[PDB]
RNA sequence: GGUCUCUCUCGU
RNA sequence: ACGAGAGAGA
């Protein structure tokens, strides 16, 4: 992706945007407990931490556009991908509005919690003042869809969020475009069927890891991805995609039946426009952090990506052996004789993306079962059960979460939660995690899961 | 102060 | 089941 232009609000007319600027996150009970060396994400151009200029460190991401349009590779991988959708026959018509608001049994209805975007956000507008669950009506939402209209620019915020030393004094916080509720609702009518698929699907004829339960998905993954392993991680997957990555989406939407009216609104979030304080500016290529689909179109970009990665990096590439899942930018993929990511990682600069060693890693090793993650987590069978497989979320990772609290109020959920994902680290581990939160007056105070309890309600999953 | 998923807690 | 809240992941 790429900033095609920047102007001030009041040549395009567009209402200002602005966010918080300081971080609800504060020091936990846990803070000098535990070691970690992540701190609140810069959320201000004027924040001493920083040494660098904030807005240009931000946008950097922005790394420009190589490809236009598909050549033959990427289509080849586009129709390989679109053909092994066709199984799945997602339903390509469209969803009701209802529906597309209020949600299904594969689709959580749309986040009232959650901003309304442009314009509503800065006329004091709120989603609960158009939808309401107990209603479902959509009487009102058909007024305003009548009244902005669609392809609304996305809103511009910084994440309030833990990042790096390293990510804090570079200035490198993570930016969300918040869609306009205009076009959650549209693209959840264009799509919601295959929104629904996906998160019914996860595996490896979605290719996406949507909708897993990582308990009891870790343990088909290494039967979903037979043979030899490989992964690797992006730098800015989302910003980096040049449009010939949306152009391929396309192909692959046609392919499996989807209207020229509805694989159109695929150009609408190729070519954006956004409001970030008192400015305007474009995009071309990136996927929009924030609109509807994020998880899925990159998870279906992500597919073409490897394909046709393959099949331009090496001779004799059969593709129907190829098995991968992913989750965003996020992959673990396999193949039946190994894969050179150095290779792939050379090609993929050719076409926008910055490919990286699995894990930070300083150079392209083996991935084997014993050191992959994905979402995060390690894989590590059972002890008791060899076939079943504990998802392991680093204690270090857990120690960050843990030394702060963005509300003091929820510590016992917080904890909760952490001791929830930490106990599949193992007894040993677990009970350290746990005689370090006693070691505090308030974690004495906490209900902490029993792990033999954990252990076996995890068995009876299966 | 986005899109989603998963899980937990608390209600009725 | 419906509501509310949290945590984590992408
Ligand atoms: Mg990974
Ligand atoms: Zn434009």
Same mark, same amino acid.
């Given at each position: 992706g790429e900033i095609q232009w920047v102007k001030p609000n009041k040549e395009t007319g567009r209402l200002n945007i602005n966010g918080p600027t300081r971080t609800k996150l504060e020091p936990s009970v846990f803070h000098d407990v535990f070691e970690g060396n992540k701190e609140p994400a810069v959320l201000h151009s004027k924040d001493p931490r920083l040494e660098v200029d904030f807005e240009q460190a931000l946008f950097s991401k922005y790394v420009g556009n190589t490809l236009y349009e598909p050549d033959e590779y990427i289509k080849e991988a586009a129709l390989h991908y679109a053909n092994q959708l066709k %199984?799945?026959?997602?339903?390509t018509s469209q969803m009701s509005m209802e529906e597309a608001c209020y949600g299904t049994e594969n689709l959580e209805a749309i986040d009232l919690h959650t901003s309304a975007g442009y314009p509503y956000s800065a006329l004091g507008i709120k989603k609960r003042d158009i939808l309401d669950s107990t209603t479902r009506d959509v009487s009102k939402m058909k007024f305003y869809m009548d009244k902005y209209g669609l392809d609304l620019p996305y809103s511009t915020y910084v994440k309030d969020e833990l990042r790096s030393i390293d990510k804090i004094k570079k200035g490198k916080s993570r930016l969300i475009e918040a869609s306009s509720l205009n076009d959650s609702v549209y693209l959840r009518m264009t799509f919601g069927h295959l929104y629904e698929t996906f998160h019914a699907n996860p595996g490896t004829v979605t290719g996406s890891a949507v909708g897993c339960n990582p308990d009891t998905f870790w343990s088909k993954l290494p039967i979903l991805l037979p043979g030899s392993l490989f992964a690797f991680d992006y730098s800015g997957y989302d910003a980096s995609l040049s449009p010939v990555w949306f152009r391929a989406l396309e192909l692959v939407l046609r392919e499996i039946g989807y209207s020229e009216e509805a694989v159109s609104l695929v150009e609408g979030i190729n070519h954006t426009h956004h409001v970030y304080r008192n400015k305007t500016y474009c995009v071309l290529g990136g996927m929009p952090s924030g609109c509807s689909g994020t998880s899925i179109f990159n998870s279906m970009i992500n597919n073409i990506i490897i394909r046709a990665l393959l099949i331009k990096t090496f001779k004799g590439i059969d593709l129907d052996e190829l098995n991968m899942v992913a989750y965003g930018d996020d992959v673990l993929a396999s193949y039946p004789f190994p894969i050179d990511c150095l290779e792939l990682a050379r090609t993929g600069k050719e076409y926008g993306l910055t490919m990286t060693p !699995?894990? /930070?890693?300083p150079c392209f090793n083996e991935v084997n079962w014993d050191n992959a993650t994905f979402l995060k987590r390690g894989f590590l069978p059972d002890? %008791?059960?060899?076939?079943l497989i504990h998802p392991t979320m680093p204690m270090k990772e857990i120690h960050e979460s843990i $030394?702060?609290? /963005?509300? !003091? $109020?929820?510590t016992q959920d917080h904890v909760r939660s952490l001791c929830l994902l930490a106990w599949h680290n193992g007894k040993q581990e677990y009970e350290k995690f746990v005689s370090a939160i006693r070691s505090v007056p308030v974690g004495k105070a906490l209900a902490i899961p029993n792990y033999e309890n954990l252990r076996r309600n995890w068995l009876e999953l299966f």
């Amino acid at each position: 992706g790429e900033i095609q232009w920047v102007k001030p609000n009041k040549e395009t007319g567009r209402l200002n945007i602005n966010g918080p600027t300081r971080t609800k996150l504060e020091p936990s009970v846990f803070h000098d407990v535990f070691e970690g060396n992540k701190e609140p994400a810069v959320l201000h151009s004027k924040d001493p931490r920083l040494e660098v200029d904030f807005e240009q460190a931000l946008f950097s991401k922005y790394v420009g556009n190589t490809l236009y349009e598909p050549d033959e590779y990427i289509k080849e991988a586009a129709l390989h991908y679109a053909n092994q959708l066709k %199984q799945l026959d997602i339903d390509t018509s469209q969803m009701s509005m209802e529906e597309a608001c209020y949600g299904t049994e594969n689709l959580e209805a749309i986040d009232l919690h959650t901003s309304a975007g442009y314009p509503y956000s800065a006329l004091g507008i709120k989603k609960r003042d158009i939808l309401d669950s107990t209603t479902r009506d959509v009487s009102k939402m058909k007024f305003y869809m009548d009244k902005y209209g669609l392809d609304l620019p996305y809103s511009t915020y910084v994440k309030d969020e833990l990042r790096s030393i390293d990510k804090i004094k570079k200035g490198k916080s993570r930016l969300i475009e918040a869609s306009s509720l205009n076009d959650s609702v549209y693209l959840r009518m264009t799509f919601g069927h295959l929104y629904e698929t996906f998160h019914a699907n996860p595996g490896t004829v979605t290719g996406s890891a949507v909708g897993c339960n990582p308990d009891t998905f870790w343990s088909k993954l290494p039967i979903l991805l037979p043979g030899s392993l490989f992964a690797f991680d992006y730098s800015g997957y989302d910003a980096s995609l040049s449009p010939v990555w949306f152009r391929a989406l396309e192909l692959v939407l046609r392919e499996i039946g989807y209207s020229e009216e509805a694989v159109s609104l695929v150009e609408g979030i190729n070519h954006t426009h956004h409001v970030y304080r008192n400015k305007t500016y474009c995009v071309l290529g990136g996927m929009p952090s924030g609109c509807s689909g994020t998880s899925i179109f990159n998870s279906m970009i992500n597919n073409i990506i490897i394909r046709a990665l393959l099949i331009k990096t090496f001779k004799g590439i059969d593709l129907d052996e190829l098995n991968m899942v992913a989750y965003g930018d996020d992959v673990l993929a396999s193949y039946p004789f190994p894969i050179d990511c150095l290779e792939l990682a050379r090609t993929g600069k050719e076409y926008g993306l910055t490919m990286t060693p !699995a894990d /930070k890693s300083p150079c392209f090793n083996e991935v084997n079962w014993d050191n992959a993650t994905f979402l995060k987590r390690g894989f590590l069978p059972d002890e %008791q059960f060899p076939f079943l497989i504990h998802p392991t979320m680093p204690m270090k990772e857990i120690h960050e979460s843990i $030394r702060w609290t /963005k509300d !003091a $109020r929820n510590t016992q959920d917080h904890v909760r939660s952490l001791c929830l994902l930490a106990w599949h680290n193992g007894k040993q581990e677990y009970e350290k995690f746990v005689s370090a939160i006693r070691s505090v007056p308030v974690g004495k105070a906490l209900a902490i899961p029993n792990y033999e309890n954990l252990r076996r309600n995890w068995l009876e999953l299966f």
